[PDB]
Amino acid sequence: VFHKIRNEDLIFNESLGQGTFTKIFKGVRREVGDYGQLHETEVLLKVLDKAHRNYSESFFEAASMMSKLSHKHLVLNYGVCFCGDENILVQEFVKFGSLDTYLKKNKNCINILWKLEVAKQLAWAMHFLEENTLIHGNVCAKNILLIREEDRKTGNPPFIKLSDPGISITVLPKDILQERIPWVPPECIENPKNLNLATDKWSFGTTLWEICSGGDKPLSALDSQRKLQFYEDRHQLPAPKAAELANLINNCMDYEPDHRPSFRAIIRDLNSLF
Ligand SMILES: c1nc2c(NC3CCCCC3)nc(Nc3ccc(N4CCOCC4)cc3)nc2[nH]1
């Protein structure tokens, strides 16, 4: 499925931290491009240990399945290196990084119309996935990548992409799912087999809360035990600072999975906010 990239064409330059059972690097890929031109392309490299075989199989099946659905708001995966003791996803490098970090670094000096445009773009990406009956399963602001900043002179909005799904919550340890409250929905805390398209509607609500809160993490003051009580008592998140999206957040974060609205309906709701 994935184009094989040879270790000899990959240069690792900078460590960018960790994901869930991944190590992330900035690097360069040497390749033959359009018209035969030789390029040194900036890439994002995600390294999984082959020994974690269940995790690696989950991670790469998810990246493969989404890359079969080419879309302007979905990250470009170039290929994989079965680099011996490690399996490496080679991805496009996105200039401005993850959205939660971007919002923090700009001190939430971001107007509501910018947030609405990013929300709409994410909703259109999710509508495409819903129409394709593909579950992402880890929608969050860390997995929103900022390709382009707003340009006030041209009127161009920011432009985002949704990153790869990562290891499925159906195979992750339960302690990890609990830490991931309130992105993982209540039905998946009850049973990870309840993963469904409805899951992404809940997580989309949590992601909107992140966007409206300038990149704060909801329930960050709560440990895992208190995160369970949060769901037990069936609380909702507080209205974010930018409260314009509070109703849509609450409508998406519906404890009844079957009541969560379609992404088509979400897009219409976003459009109605003037
Ligand atoms: C697919 N996935 C990607 C990224 N994911 C992030 C990698 C770092 C940890 C959070 C997720 N970053 C990407 N690029 C970055 C660009 C600038 C970055 N810096 C912004 C300014 O502040 C320091 C980090 C970080 C990552 N590209 C990418 N393609």
Side-chain angles (χ1 to χ4, degrees), residues 1-151 154-173 175-192 194-240 242-274:
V1 284
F2 268 132
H3 181 263
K4 280 164 164 274
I5 300 174
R6 33 192 285 260
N7 182 10
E8 311 87 51
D9 288 349
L10 294 179
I11 302 155
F12 294 74
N13 285 335
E14 173 177 359
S15 172
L16 294 179
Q18 283 180 346
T20 304
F21 298 118
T22 69
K23 281 194 76 62
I24 300 154
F25 302 88
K26 181 172 187 193
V28 171
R29 182 202 175 187
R30 291 201 213 75
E31 55 172 333
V32 188
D34 283 346
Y35 309 113
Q37 183 54 48
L38 244 180
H39 289 117
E40 275 202 336
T41 301
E42 290 188 326
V43 290
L44 194 290
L45 306 158
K46 296 186 164 157
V47 182
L48 285 88
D49 181 355
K50 271 209 71 56
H52 306 318
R53 188 154 189 275
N54 294 331
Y55 293 171
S56 183
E57 286 186 2
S58 182
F59 180 100
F60 283 100
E61 179 68 353
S64 171
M65 286 302 298
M66 202 168 83
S67 287
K68 295 184 185 132
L69 306 177
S70 196
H71 193 275
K72 68 181 183 186
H73 288 309
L74 298 178
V75 65
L76 175 59
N77 293 323
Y78 294 120
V80 307
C81 180
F82 301 101
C83 277
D85 283 307
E86 283 163 342
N87 302 130
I88 304 179
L89 182 66
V90 188
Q91 283 188 327
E92 66 173 308
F93 185 82
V94 175
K95 186 170 169 187
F96 298 98
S98 53
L99 182 64
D100 64 322
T101 294
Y102 182 88
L103 292 173
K104 277 255 169 285
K105 278 189 141 267
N106 284 272
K107 300 289 170 289
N108 201 23
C109 294
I110 309 283
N111 96 92
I112 186 64
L113 298 169
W114 190 108
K115 294 177 179 171
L116 288 177
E117 289 302 307
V118 168
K120 287 196 270 200
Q121 292 176 27
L122 179 59
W124 274 108
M126 297 314 298
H127 168 72
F128 177 81
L129 295 181
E130 182 171 22
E131 292 280 86
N132 281 277
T133 68
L134 185 154
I135 300 162
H136 184 277
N138 194 17
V139 181
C140 62
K142 282 181 175 145
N143 278 342
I144 305 310
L145 310 173
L146 184 67
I147 297 284
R148 194 183 69 202
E149 292 189 294
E150 157 190 285
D151 184 298
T154 59
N156 283 345
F159 189 99
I160 61 88
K161 291 192 182 192
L162 177 62
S163 197
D164 59 288
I167 294 161
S168 172
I169 53 183
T170 60
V171 310
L172 291 174
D175 56 297
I176 297 285
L177 300 208
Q178 295 183 18
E179 278 194 328
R180 285 193 186 179
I181 295 170
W183 292 267
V184 178
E187 69 275 10
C188 290
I189 297 306
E190 146 174 319
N191 185 346
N194 286 327
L195 184 68
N196 185 262
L197 286 170
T199 293
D200 286 335
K201 298 170 168 75
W202 178 281
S203 307
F204 173 88
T206 313
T207 301
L208 281 186
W209 190 97
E210 295 182 273
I211 292 169
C212 290
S213 297
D216 292 340
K217 301 284 178 298
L219 304 185
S220 56
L222 301 185
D223 84 300
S224 296
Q225 178 268 117
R226 293 190 165 117
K227 281 175 166 187
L228 297 182
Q229 176 70 348
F230 179 86
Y231 275 176
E232 209 80 25
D233 301 350
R234 298 172 90 82
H235 288 292
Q236 302 303 329
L237 296 181
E244 288 89 342
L245 296 184
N247 288 333
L248 179 60
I249 294 160
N250 284 334
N251 287 340
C252 289
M253 302 185 71
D254 196 308
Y255 279 78
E256 203 64 64
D258 290 347
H259 296 354
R260 297 171 194 150
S262 71
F263 278 102
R264 172 185 298 101
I266 291 167
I267 287 161
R268 300 214 168 92
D269 214 44
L270 285 169
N271 289 339
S272 86
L273 284 149
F274 316 115

